[PDB]
Amino acid sequence: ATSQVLHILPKPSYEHAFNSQRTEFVTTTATNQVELYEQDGNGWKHARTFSDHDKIVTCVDWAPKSNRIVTCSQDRNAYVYEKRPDGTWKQTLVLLRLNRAATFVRWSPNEDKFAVGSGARVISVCYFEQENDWWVSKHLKRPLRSTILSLDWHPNNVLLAAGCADRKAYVLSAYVRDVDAKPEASVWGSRLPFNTVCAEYPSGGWVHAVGFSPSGNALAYAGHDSSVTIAYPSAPEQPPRALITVKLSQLPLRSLLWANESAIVAAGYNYSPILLQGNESGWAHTRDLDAGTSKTEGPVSFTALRSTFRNMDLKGSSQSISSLPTVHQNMIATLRPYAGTPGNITAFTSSGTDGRVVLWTL
């Protein structure tokens, strides 16, 4: 797998999103700001900040077809950003009605609603009313017992998966009338009203990541125990066909993405994207996409003269501290499609706590 480092951000990057044309990306720095980056030849340039949040921004997402950015923060708010004709962005506060921080945000596949995970034991499913010119929030709350660490939407607009700090992965209906048309019958159910519970799958550690299969017929999720579990449902009120856990030898995956119906890429505290492959008969960790998993006299500049004396003075010796062998130098926080049709992701991007934004080609 080829990798290219697109940019190095000055501060940590728990989330990023590209637009549909991959011509700009938005990223959450560790502050209350969000950074918008545009192309600059083969490089990238900081086009503008957003700074409407009061406390640390936790997550950000960019809607492909409708070209809107949604942002979430420890200030308990969300803002939706929409493009004006003159090229500036219109902010819009969304009243999430959360008692604690917003922790994670995702746009729905039809982009008519988004969901915000929280530390408040609830998920704010947010949709727009043209009759009021308001974004309004519905709380999913019945089975959720702790911080929601991650969200994913089923390819049908109704079902929401959630990874939770109570060591469970939930599948919940986020069906909203006068936004959704009725969902088709599925392996998760057919009688599917708001906050109906399709699964409460267990984990060995906090569920950092969740992801539906490209067909929607299975859920992968990743735990803080350094495992990926893949769940194949049977029917409502019935146990799964298979509930396959693969246990990794590395530090935990924080993020997770189906490459196709039979393969998953995952990454996290191991600093490296891994590939898992399988089906309802069994799953295995099959490759590491970073070759760095294998642990792989002339004139001298003023900045080398000065830094070797600063290293002798501040540290033990002149010798510079070496890079980690992986491309990411710190945990890789998010893992997102970049190229190929849905069901056949050909390339994906990652961003990390080291501020690298990196493109990976399978």
Binding site: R145, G205, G223, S226, K247, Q250
Partner: protein, 151 residues
């Protein structure tokens, strides 16, 4: 004065460990009998000089629960005694043939051993820790951090 009165402990009851970890589907006397069948096999395997099979049989079941400290400490006494009687050259060949669940149980019980040095020899538990982590990787300790508190 009011500042010190704990209202949160009665107005918002926090999650218990059994809300996070599923309840044990066996009674205290049922697990105490199951371990009391295994400890004599583990002791007997030392006398025949087959301490590797002593661990492989002892490791086939593990006690857990806050209601079973007496039989958990008896199982830990047998576990540290078995690990102390395996030859240090046999460890690499045994660890590579353990399942991920047997490895998870070994690295969990060497951790219970390392917590009490006045009872248990740390020198052999650290030698086992080096070899189990070298062969099976860091994720086996990550599974111990994430493990149940009444193991």
């Amino acid at each position: 004065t009011f500042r010190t009165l704990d209202v949160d402990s009665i107005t918002e009851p926090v999650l218990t460990e059994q809300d996070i970890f599923p309840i044990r589907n066996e009674t205290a006397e049922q697990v105490q009998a199951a371990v009391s069948q295994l400890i004599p096999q583990a002791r007997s395997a030392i006398q025949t000089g087959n301490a590797l099979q002593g661990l492989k049989t002892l490791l086939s079941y593990v006690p857990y629960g806050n209601d079973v400290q007496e039989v958990r400490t008896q199982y830990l006494n047998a576990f540290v005694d078995v690990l102390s009687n395996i030859r240090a050259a046999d460890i690499p060949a045994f660890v590579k043939e353990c399942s991920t669940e047997e490895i998870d149980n070994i690295v969990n019980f060497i951790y219970r051993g390392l917590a009490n040095p006045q009872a248990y020899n740390s020198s052999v538990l650290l030698n086992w820790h080096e070899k189990v982590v070298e062969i099976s990787g860091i994720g086996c300790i990550v599974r111990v951090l994430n493990s149940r508190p009444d193991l």
